[PDB]
Design an enzyme around this catalytic site. Structure first.
Site, PDB file in Angstrom:
ATOM      1  N   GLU A  97       0.880  -1.165   0.000  1.00 23.09           N
ATOM      2  CA  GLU A  97       0.000   0.000   0.000  1.00 23.09           C
ATOM      3  C   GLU A  97       0.916   1.212   0.000  1.00 23.09           C
ATOM      4  OE1 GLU A  97      -3.268  -0.075   2.667  1.00 23.09           O
ATOM      5  OE2 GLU A  97      -3.470   2.091   2.868  1.00 23.09           O
ATOM      6  N   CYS A 123       2.394 -13.248 -15.375  1.00 25.31           N
ATOM      7  CA  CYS A 123       2.791 -12.689 -16.669  1.00 25.31           C
ATOM      8  C   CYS A 123       1.629 -12.282 -17.587  1.00 25.31           C
ATOM      9  CB  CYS A 123       3.697 -13.676 -17.412  1.00 25.31           C
ATOM     10  SG  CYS A 123       2.798 -15.055 -18.186  1.00 25.31           S
TER      11      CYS A 123
END
Lengths: 326, 344
Positions: A97, A123
């Site tokens: 965060e 990916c």
């Protein structure tokens, strides 16, 4: 059901500046090679990765993504004030965060209307990001979106190499440490737009996803990945109207040379239609697909009307496939 | 006069909702006992947890509970609440700040645990305490288009590590005032989990409807709260001031696109940073405090799971009636502010 009004306004990539060759990696590992009698160049001869790029010290994912974003905005000929959405899709992330996207956005100076967040999906996340942005564009929520992705591997090389050269290091697991030595640094960014704003720009049609999350628990990855891709290609045939011979380029994520060859073989794909950068850049995670697409664009390999397949098999397992018409 | 949709979501519903309260209570009293020598060294005489932040307890899991485990628990419960099997789920998004691995996605782990079908699309969304709303929006766009019938949005939060390491750092004989203040807000976090099944409305005619909403940002404030697995540093003062400013902008947009006027909303489900932050927020916008349920006092700040946990607790308490207009609101690190509406 396919997207009718979603385009690619701009695209860019960044190649990381420092080269670390597998020859150099091997020299450093040689003593540890002579112990345990390895006598085999796994990286160079098997995986087919001869070099990868590293960033300067203290370059964060957000920094790399920001560099790519600036270049993609120039490619699109638009100012940051036009961007209504910025999604970051990288595996590498500055913090848990806030989002890496918010940091990139702060670097760029987005407006107070700009919505941002991260998407993570091994990916495949750049493709997921494109679909997410496409749906907002299509609905008229935004006019322009940035999808950005910076990958860093400096730390993983430092720690892994340090680990592998210690006197206590044992083999069986050590062989898995070599996998991290196929990763590379790089970044990419794409500006997507509503089509009526950018006539003659490539069109994004959307795509399909199939999963095999029963395998979320490398040799195994190969076979099960191709099985999954087969399912996904069957789906693509139905929603995309795909036939292998009709596609002009396959832009695919790259885990290694053996994995790519097995894929091309399995689908009967013309290898000439599959650009690869793994040899010199290694595996750039979710940035791989857009980096390759950007290189194809900059090389003048893409012509108006080309049908381009974007695809990857990601950890999960997941497989996503999507079409762009140049 | 014919009017458009304002781009709000149509025919998207909430088929099911659930929360999990973590099992172990850690009181601020026990924390203060541990911190007392440091309080005394720093001259701190006020109960900055219980009296200032307004947190009396929070819940923790066992050490070996991962975010995916908590998320999975909530998801199984949400499926039961929606009375559907996992085979009906075409999208699963994980929205938690807590994360099992860099790769693969926490979503893939939860999906594997649950046994989703091979048609199920999955990924993580990360956006500090607003990500659950982002996930709902992303799912809504697919449901509205009819690409899927049902979606799961899931969120498990694990604060065990940040408590363990922060308390160690904050009880160092050498900790500075500055670092103590920097890390204090980490002691307001809590563990918990939530999950929601969303659906095309035609499948669940009587279910609550989700409309979507608006977002505004102030990303020049992205440094204010930074967190990893074991540490969170937070400028609480600036979060409050810049947060309220951002929320004021967002409320103007909410009035424009959702047609909001505060007196006409029946419930406000507000992400909570602290008691005084919430009080300033409610006062700033003239919100009736009776319309604001809080669990912060006993559960702390559960990040992006906070809003759906409170919504689930409201449903379970029988506080929600058909027709109720429910505002979902939060200010998340970024800074971002989002405001959305559910009609029960």
């Amino acid at each position: 059901m396919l997207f009718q009004n979603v385009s690619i306004a701009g695209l860019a990539h960044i190649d990381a500046p420092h080269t670390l060759t597998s020859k150099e990696i091997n020299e450093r590992l040689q003593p540890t090679y002579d112990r345990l009698g390895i006598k085999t160049d796994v990286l160079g001869d098997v995986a087919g990765i001869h070099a990868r790029r590293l960033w300067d010290q203290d370059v964060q994912a957000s920094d790399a993504a920001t560099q790519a974003a600036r270049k993609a905005l120039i490619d699109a000929n638009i100012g940051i004030e036009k961007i209504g959405l910025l999604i970051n899709t990288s595996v590498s992330r500055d913090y848990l965060e806030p989002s890496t996207a918010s940091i990139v956005s702060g670097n760029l100076g987005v407006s107070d209307h700009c919505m941002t967040f991260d998407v993570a999906n091994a990916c495949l996340a750049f493709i997921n990001g494109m679909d997410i942005a496409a749906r907002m564009l299509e609905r008229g929520e935004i006019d322009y979106a940035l999808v950005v992705d910076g990958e860093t591997a400096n730390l993983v090389y430092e720690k892994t190499l340090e680990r592998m050269t210690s006197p206590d290091v044992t083999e069986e697991e050590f062989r898995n440490e070599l996998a991290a030595l196929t990763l590379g640094c790089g970044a990419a960014a794409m500006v997507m737009a509503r089509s009526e704003l950018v006539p003659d720009a490539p069109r994004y049609k959307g795509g399909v996803t199939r999963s095999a999350t029963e395998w979320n628990k490398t040799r195994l990855l190969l076979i099960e990945g191709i099985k999954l891709a087969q399912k996904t290609f069957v789906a693509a045939k139905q929603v995309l109207g795909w036939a292998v011979e009709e596609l002009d380029q396959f832009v695919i994520h790259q885990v290694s040379r053996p994995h790519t060859a097995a894929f091309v073989k399995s689908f009967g794909i013309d290898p000439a239609k599959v650009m690869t950068i793994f040899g010199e850049h290694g595996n750039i995670g979710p940035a791989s697909v857009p980096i390759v697409l950007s290189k194809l664009k900059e090389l003048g390999r893409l012509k108006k009307g080309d049908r381009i397949a974007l695809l990857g098999i990601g950890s999960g397992l997941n497989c996503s496939m999507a079409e762009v018409v140049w």
